[PDB]
Design a protein around this ligand. Sequence first.
Ligand SMILES: *[C@@H]1O[C@H](CO)[C@@H](O[C@@H]2O[C@H](CO)[C@@H](O)[C@H](O)[C@H]2NC(C)=O)[C@H](O)[C@H]1NC(C)=O
Ligand SMILES: *[C@@H]1O[C@H](CO)[C@@H](O[C@@H]2O[C@H](CO)[C@@H](O)[C@H](O)[C@H]2NC(C)=O)[C@H](O)[C@H]1NC(C)=O
Ligand SMILES: *[C@@H]1O[C@H](CO)[C@@H](O[C@@H]2O[C@H](CO)[C@@H](O)[C@H](O)[C@H]2NC(C)=O)[C@H](O)[C@H]1NC(C)=O
Ligand SMILES: *[C@@H]1O[C@H](CO)[C@@H](O[C@@H]2O[C@H](CO)[C@@H](O)[C@H](O)[C@H]2NC(C)=O)[C@H](O)[C@H]1NC(C)=O
Ligand SMILES: *[C@@H]1O[C@H](CO)[C@@H](O[C@@H]2O[C@H](CO)[C@@H](O)[C@H](O)[C@H]2NC(C)=O)[C@H](O)[C@H]1NC(C)=O
Ligand SMILES: *[C@@H]1O[C@H](CO)[C@@H](O)[C@H](O)[C@H]1NC(C)=O
Ligand SMILES: *[C@@H]1O[C@H](CO)[C@@H](O)[C@H](O)[C@H]1NC(C)=O
Ligand SMILES: *[C@@H]1O[C@H](CO)[C@@H](O)[C@H](O)[C@H]1NC(C)=O
Ligand SMILES: *[C@@H]1O[C@H](CO)[C@@H](O)[C@H](O)[C@H]1NC(C)=O
Ligand SMILES: *[C@@H]1O[C@H](CO)[C@@H](O)[C@H](O)[C@H]1NC(C)=O
Lengths: 236, 364
Amino acid sequence: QCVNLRTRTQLPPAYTNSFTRGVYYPDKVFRSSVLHSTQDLFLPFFSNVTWFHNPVLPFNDGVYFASTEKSNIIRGWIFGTTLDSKTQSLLIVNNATNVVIKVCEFQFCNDPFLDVYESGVYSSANNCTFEYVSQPFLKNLREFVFKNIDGYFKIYSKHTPINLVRDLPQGFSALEPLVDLPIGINITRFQTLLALHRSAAAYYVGYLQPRTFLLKYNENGTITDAVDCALDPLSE
Amino acid sequence: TKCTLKSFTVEKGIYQTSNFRVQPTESIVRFPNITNLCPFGEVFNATRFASVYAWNRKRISNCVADYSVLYNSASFSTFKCYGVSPTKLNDLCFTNVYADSFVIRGDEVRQIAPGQTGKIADYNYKLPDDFTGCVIAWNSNNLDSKVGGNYNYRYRLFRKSNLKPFERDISTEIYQAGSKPCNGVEGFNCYFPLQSYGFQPTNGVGYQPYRVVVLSFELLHAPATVCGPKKSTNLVKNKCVNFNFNGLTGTGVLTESNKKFLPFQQFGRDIADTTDAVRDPQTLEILDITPCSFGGVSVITPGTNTSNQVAVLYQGVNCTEVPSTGSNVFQTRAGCLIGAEHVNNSYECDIPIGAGICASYQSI
Ligand SMILES: *[C@@H]1O[C@H](CO)[C@@H](O[C@@H]2O[C@H](CO)[C@@H](O)[C@H](O)[C@H]2NC(C)=O)[C@H](O)[C@H]1NC(C)=O
Ligand SMILES: *[C@@H]1O[C@H](CO)[C@@H](O[C@@H]2O[C@H](CO)[C@@H](O)[C@H](O)[C@H]2NC(C)=O)[C@H](O)[C@H]1NC(C)=O
Ligand SMILES: *[C@@H]1O[C@H](CO)[C@@H](O[C@@H]2O[C@H](CO)[C@@H](O)[C@H](O)[C@H]2NC(C)=O)[C@H](O)[C@H]1NC(C)=O
Ligand SMILES: *[C@@H]1O[C@H](CO)[C@@H](O[C@@H]2O[C@H](CO)[C@@H](O)[C@H](O)[C@H]2NC(C)=O)[C@H](O)[C@H]1NC(C)=O
Ligand SMILES: *[C@@H]1O[C@H](CO)[C@@H](O[C@@H]2O[C@H](CO)[C@@H](O)[C@H](O)[C@H]2NC(C)=O)[C@H](O)[C@H]1NC(C)=O
Ligand SMILES: *[C@@H]1O[C@H](CO)[C@@H](O)[C@H](O)[C@H]1NC(C)=O
Ligand SMILES: *[C@@H]1O[C@H](CO)[C@@H](O)[C@H](O)[C@H]1NC(C)=O
Ligand SMILES: *[C@@H]1O[C@H](CO)[C@@H](O)[C@H](O)[C@H]1NC(C)=O
Ligand SMILES: *[C@@H]1O[C@H](CO)[C@@H](O)[C@H](O)[C@H]1NC(C)=O
Ligand SMILES: *[C@@H]1O[C@H](CO)[C@@H](O)[C@H](O)[C@H]1NC(C)=O
């Protein structure tokens, strides 16, 4: 059911400034009107992140994914190491009703995509271990953070009503935790899933590195400001 | 006072003797409403159980399993837990469970055990000597046995080699007993490895069918997901008690709080990393923790020469939990004071107490 197309999906791989996006709650502890310094993996301020306008990309320590989505074209993600049945493959799809997460040794095609008239991008589904169904994640800006530590997969998310033309706006917004997975995999690469009908896709990708941040909690316990300490001397 | 001062006479003044702290009364535990019970109903109470050489395999992961209800069940003839004690199986647990279910004769139940060999133990199913888990078997003569002949159940009888641990054989190759090859048809030296069982409602004890399910618990480095619940209990308030709220342990008094937790945090700390507020896993409300009171004690004496009646001051302790009656009790900004009277006059200060007040001897 999966066959290669004629034209290459050559999306322009440009660069864009990160500004001050990609801050999430590091724990589940309530703090009121206090400044707290924490050392963890983050996305450094004012970095140059990659912009696509669908190859295989390395996973590294963590991944920050952003989509200036209109009409919900982006549908899912694929994670793994060998991207076949020889190693565990993680699959996430948010279809029309609910999100489905699978951990199985699938057999994907060269260029998987969702297809419309369910999941047929895999030619086999054997030795399944973990299954999960939950509420759907999704002119909007959708931000997600994917991390994998000691057999635990952490997904944080945030939705924003945006009206800017092209790039990420100059603003600050923390990312609340969304989902945890108690599954042990050693993912090294990933992919993006599009529901393209048989008959112009832009997103932003950034990586994470360890560093120290300073966060401010207001009286209600919401993160409102942050400072990167491994930067210009004033910030330090 | 004489003990601390190490003398048989005491000069007039105020001295510090010992400390005082409110002891905890009882302990409480909190845990969520529980969910995702493990589905043993469709395994042990299954309508049909496969053959011994083709035992049904079921995977158990990501649920909660109460072993007390099956432990107390008397409907099972044999319940042997070898790797671990049956009672403590509710606490200790492994990352996954494998259930192997089949039916055998009553005389063959002993073969299904570590360090056991036999026709069933070597031709149909093999159990390793290092196996950890449990085996639960019960008679099924009233169900599995058939009046017309329960020939649906088959057991493997012929194989050159034995069975590996946790190995299932479903091959129906015509076994060759001798050196004479057979072209798919059983001959003098060729016989069918599978023999059909002859269960009947009245066939004797030992020959009757018996449903046996073996649960093997495996603890691969993946996180453990299936074992017994945590027994919660009710909560109390306005009492210095010790608690283990969802694994977070601490001692103090619990009160109602007006703090507004954001919908995903569980507990809070103000500064210097000291927990103040927690969220109960069942009611989902924010509480407040305060360490129960403590402080030093002091004795006011007019000197051994003058008299031998003293007064007792508890520092920074509210006049609510003194123990115990003595004399009239006074509550001051410095704490509580027993054994002395309060007057409206004003003299010079002899034995300073604090907060602008002090006491003397007249009584004290
Ligand atoms: C979107 O995915 C969900 C999750 O798999 C689908 O819901 C299931 O659909 C199957 C087949 O129709 C049923 O057997 C399940 O009982 C459904 N589960 C739930 C929780 O509803 C849903 O059908 C999918 N929708 C589309 C349009 O693909
Ligand atoms: C298919 O599933 C089986 C078990 O369902 C996997 O067997 C495990 O293999 C690992 C590899 O070392 C062992 O450590 C485990 O003890 C095995 N048994 C388990 C987990 O129950 C097998 O690896 C799976 N196949 C693939 C390709 O992953
Ligand atoms: C923090 O929480 C308080 C309490 O909910 C918020 O105060 C409310 O603000 C809204 C709109 O600003 C008013 O309609 C309510 O009447 C306020 N309630 C109270 C009790 O003051 C406050 O806005 C939140 N945010 C900050 C930064 O304080
Ligand atoms: C945990 O279970 C208890 C017991 O049902 C839930 O308490 C109920 O809450 C509803 C909501 O108003 C009341 O109508 C019931 O009377 C309560 N039951 C009692 C007091 O026995 C509680 O909400 C549950 N907590 C969860 C699901 O987080
Ligand atoms: C010692 O404890 C008592 C009992 O809690 C306190 O009395 C309360 O004081 C508050 C504050 O004025 C009142 O709102 C309550 O109505 C009082 N309760 C009773 C039963 O009297 C007392 O204040 C505490 N001591 C000090 C010095 O604060
Ligand atoms: C854009 O990214 C490149 C990385 O190839 C970097 O060298 C350059 O400084 C970036 N531009 C900025 C930060 O303005
Ligand atoms: C992933 O591969 C690395 C390669 O060295 C290995 O050390 C690790 O144990 C593997 N983890 C899993 C979950 O397969
Ligand atoms: C099987 O059914 C009986 C009768 O209701 C019940 O007592 C027993 O607990 C059930 N066992 C399982 C494993 O569901
Ligand atoms: C108390 O002290 C006086 C001296 O001021 C002395 O005369 C008297 O004997 C003392 N009484 C005692 C030690 O009991
Ligand atoms: C005086 O002292 C008495 C008891 O010693 C007390 O009841 C009273 O409140 C004080 N003040 C006045 C004005 O009487």
